[PDB]
Amino acid sequence: KLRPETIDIQRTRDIPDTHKAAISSLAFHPRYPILLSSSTSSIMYLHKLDASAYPTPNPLLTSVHVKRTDLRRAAFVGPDGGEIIFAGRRRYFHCWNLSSGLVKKVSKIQGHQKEQRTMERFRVSPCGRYMALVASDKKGGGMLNIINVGTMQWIAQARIDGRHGVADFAWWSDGNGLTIAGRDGQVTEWSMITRRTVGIWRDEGSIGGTVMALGGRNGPAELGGDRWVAIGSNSGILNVYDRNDLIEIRIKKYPTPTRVFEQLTTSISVVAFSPDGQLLAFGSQHKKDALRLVHLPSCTVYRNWPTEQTPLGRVTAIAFSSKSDVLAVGNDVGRVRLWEIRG
Amino acid sequence: DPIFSQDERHLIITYNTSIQVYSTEDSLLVRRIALPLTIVSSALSKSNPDYLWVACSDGRIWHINWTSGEGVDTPSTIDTKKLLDMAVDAVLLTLNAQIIAYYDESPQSLRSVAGGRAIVAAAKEALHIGILDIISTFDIRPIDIDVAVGGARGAIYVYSIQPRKYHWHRRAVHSVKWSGDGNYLISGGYETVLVLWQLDTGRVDFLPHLSAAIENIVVSPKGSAYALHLDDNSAMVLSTAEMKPSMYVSVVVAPQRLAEIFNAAPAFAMPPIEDVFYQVASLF
Amino acid sequence: SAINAVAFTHSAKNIQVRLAIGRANGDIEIWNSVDGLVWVTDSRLFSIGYTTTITEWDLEKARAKKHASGQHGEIWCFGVQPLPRKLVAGTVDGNLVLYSIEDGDLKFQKTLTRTPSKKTKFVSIAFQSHNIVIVGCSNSTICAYDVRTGTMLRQMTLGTDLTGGSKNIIVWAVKCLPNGDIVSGDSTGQVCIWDGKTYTQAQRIQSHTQDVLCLSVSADGSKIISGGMDRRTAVYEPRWSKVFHRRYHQHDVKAMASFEGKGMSVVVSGGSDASPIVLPLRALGKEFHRTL
Amino acid sequence: SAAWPKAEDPALVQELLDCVQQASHYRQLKKGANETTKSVNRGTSELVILAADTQPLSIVLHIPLICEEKNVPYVYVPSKVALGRACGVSRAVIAVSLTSNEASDLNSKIRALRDKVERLA
RNA sequence: CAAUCGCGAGGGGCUCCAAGCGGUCGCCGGCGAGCACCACCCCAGCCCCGCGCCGCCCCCA
């Protein structure tokens, strides 16, 4: 419960560990106050979030060096959060338990190794059942190979058409299908049950389209039940759409954003919702304090945070907590900072 | 014929002399359990326990368990011919040339279809479905049924009237099983290659090089690890997508719009404040 | 010597149905260098060789009646519309050219639209409905159009050529369904059924090793018969799957044609072994036959 | 309607707006209807795009006349917002004109682009 | 790098020498980088294919 125009954020003490590369991915645990930090310097860190800790607040649980990979993305798996799947640019990806301590190397996606020469651009569904990989072959299109993580086996494929393929995609919050931001302005509301596209619709004026997030409650249950979608472009404009206004299954081919966000001038590189569906933090990594924060459903940018003097750095990754009360920002030099949010 | 446990961490292998259980997590054999020959099958008990069911080549029904050595004393010989085939359900049924349950050609094998029961009998080219190419092996999945038959050649016919040819093997097939959620058809062969039939978008991807040994494969109780029986007297619990053996067994409103409510018609000649209030509250 | 086009007169009494073949000399032969031929019913056949002329053929005269031509370049495909008539003929230069079949005359009517890239050579067409067209391309794209307005519906772009060498997926054959979907038989061996309401793909069945040059559907939308640059044809049944594949043929298979009438539901294939070869539709029924 | 050189959304619009953006980065770009009109009347213009998403399209219908007089190719894209952030303006650009110089790879891209526009008209 | 093996310009009568250059097995050899040798576009070039001019040779004249 927080009002639209002025936020009660505050600086919690930062993470002690510093990385030798930029922070490529952050992820909070979905059950516990645990931060997973992961950089291009081959190292992941787990930190427990206790601000009254001693000797060093926000202490370190463990520090995993993964050999020879540069960690592009690490992610918790499931609502329980018992696995961490992580991947660099290399042709394999690991999964790791949190209940048994098993590192497994998935090195073969099942007859699609020609189709995949990375594993870096993956997502895992909110129900934890499935996990989509961007297949790294374009020639005028882009496909998502869907993995069953209970077996780690390919079961489905999610090709859309564009120039340079998929920009960025998001699982439906029910888990029953996808929504895929391509690189021409086409956004595909894909369905997993029918394994077919529900409908293709265009962003408002996107040249390229760079990133994409999704989330909220009380949305279209035939489109996964998640309410808001934000799509960011090469021009730094973030368009925010209510997904209840894609239905007229007949998807509106030219819908209107609920709000055009035009504050940032350079290419939107991060976008995230708070998992209660009340905040949208988006930003760029080509200017210094290029991080903005948006109240939803009202679609207003908060004007008091950040300031001139908020230490952010060139923001490479952000992450909201499981209770939507701690924000994490990791930058181009390798330092996580944390902010509690009150409401 | 090898079989897992209900809690996945125990593998179960019959030899030509005894029954040996194994740790899927850590080590080799746990129990040498006595089982003389003075072997047809061994499955688990279905409804309440997980004891065992072993049938020898003639009628001697061993009802024997792990977590003990109990059951080394009680066979049963209710049937008169040498036992050929054997299947349990929940309720036991045994193929002798015909069934006894609780026909033209030579029998091969017999398998049982789950709780709303059905029976699948197997002669050479005949196959008997019961509601209530020359065969080598076959598996099945329910939910309303699908039957994958192998063959003495490398053709794997699939049935849900018309089969489907899934021919890969340059000899007999020795193993055909449905994978997990039914997406893949994991098959084996004489030529050491464990083929993963895609059965979706019709591709094939496999585990080629191995100890010249593939016959009698089995699938985990979950979608996880397949255990392989292996003709060099070896079993091999392989976790999935590793293909590495785990076990080897050998109200926001901008102020300027309210300023725009109060810009024109300065104090006098303004609309009355019922109307101006309707402008303001209509802005809010 | 080789087959390049097969077509049946009808596909549904003593009603004169005939079979029209195109032999790679330039010949045409009818059973009870040319490149394509169709019939029209409301019944006369139209053919193209590699040149831009699209010509009718009078049968009782056995002479090339009523040639047609145009400006653009080499016709590589053409086809006639269904009913709720014209011809649509796609070429090398990216034009698709409408010809008029007003009551008896074959006219160069109109060029509706054309791709911006000149390097998009069309290969085949099929008609998803009455007034809207599906065309394969020499790039990975297959593309829909409307001839009410000429407009350019959704590019249905295939991938890259993964298996080695080239980049472009050259889509050799495109056919349609009574369900409303369309099969695209591309290069690199694969087939893929694309959905019809949203014009996206729904299934990518990899069967062949080399490029499927021709395919044809049943008249009830039940059996799909592919035929490739291998020696190989393959059948497909219900979203789909294949059943089997037997090398009926000896060279690549170049042209299919199906018929489902008179108690004789056969599909005839021809390629470059100079031997036309006829199949049933009931492929578990009995054997096949061949004719030369 | 009056948009008879309508550019097709299958990537011809995308190559138009991309060349708009690259000419915007080479400063070869006259933005808006009035400055477009000045570039066509002065004859500096090498190609000109309009927007068919104009709410009254009469306010950009005047430049196809003088583009027919100066013999420069014009073509319509269906979104003035896509043209607007294709330019990089933060407002809606309704009609854009893009010139050339003696030697640039951009001038080569203009040449191939109005070759495609000539394939339309 | 270490063991090992091969060919052979060039010169001399199947043999002889040699400039050189590669392969295999071990490297508790070291260095460098990992989508991307890709996507979008443009300018050329190798090759293969089309069509018409010349350069030459012809035969009558």
Description:
This is part of a larger assembly, with chains A (343 residues), B (284 residues), C (292 residues) and D (121 residues). Chain A is mainly β and 343 residues long. In chain A, strands 1-30-29-28 form a four-stranded antiparallel β-sheet, with no helix packed on it. Chain A has a four-stranded antiparallel β-sheet with strand order 2-3-4-5, with no helix packed on it. Chain A is globular and about 55 Å long. Chain A has strands at residues 8-12, 23-28, 34-39, 43-48, 60-65, 73-77, 83-87, 93-97, 103-106, 122-124, 130-134, 141-142, 144-148, 153-157, 160-161, 166-171, 177-182, 186-191, 196-202, 211-215, 228-232, 238-242, 259-261, 268-273, 279-284, 291-295, 300-301, 315-320, 326-331, 336-342. In chain B, a hairpin with a 2-residue loop joins β13 (138-142) and β14 (145-149). The longest helix of chain B is centred in the last third of the chain and has 11 residues, at 273-283. Chain C is mainly β and 292 residues long. Helices cover 0% and strands 48% of the residues of chain C. In chain C, the strands form seven sheets. Chain C has a four-stranded antiparallel β-sheet with strand order 4-5-6-7, with no helix packed on it. Chain C has a four-stranded antiparallel β-sheet with strand order 8-9-10-11, with no helix packed on it. Chain C has a four-stranded antiparallel β-sheet with strand order 12-13-14-15, with no helix packed on it. Chain C starts with a strand and ends with a strand. Helix content of chain D is 45%, strand content 16%. The two termini of chain D are 15 Å apart. Chain D has 121 residues and is α+β, with helices and mostly antiparallel strands. Chain D is globular, with a radius of gyration of 13 Å. In chain D, α1 (12-25) packs parallel to α4 (80-87) and α1 (12-25) runs antiparallel to α5. Chain D has a four-stranded mixed β-sheet, with helices on both faces.
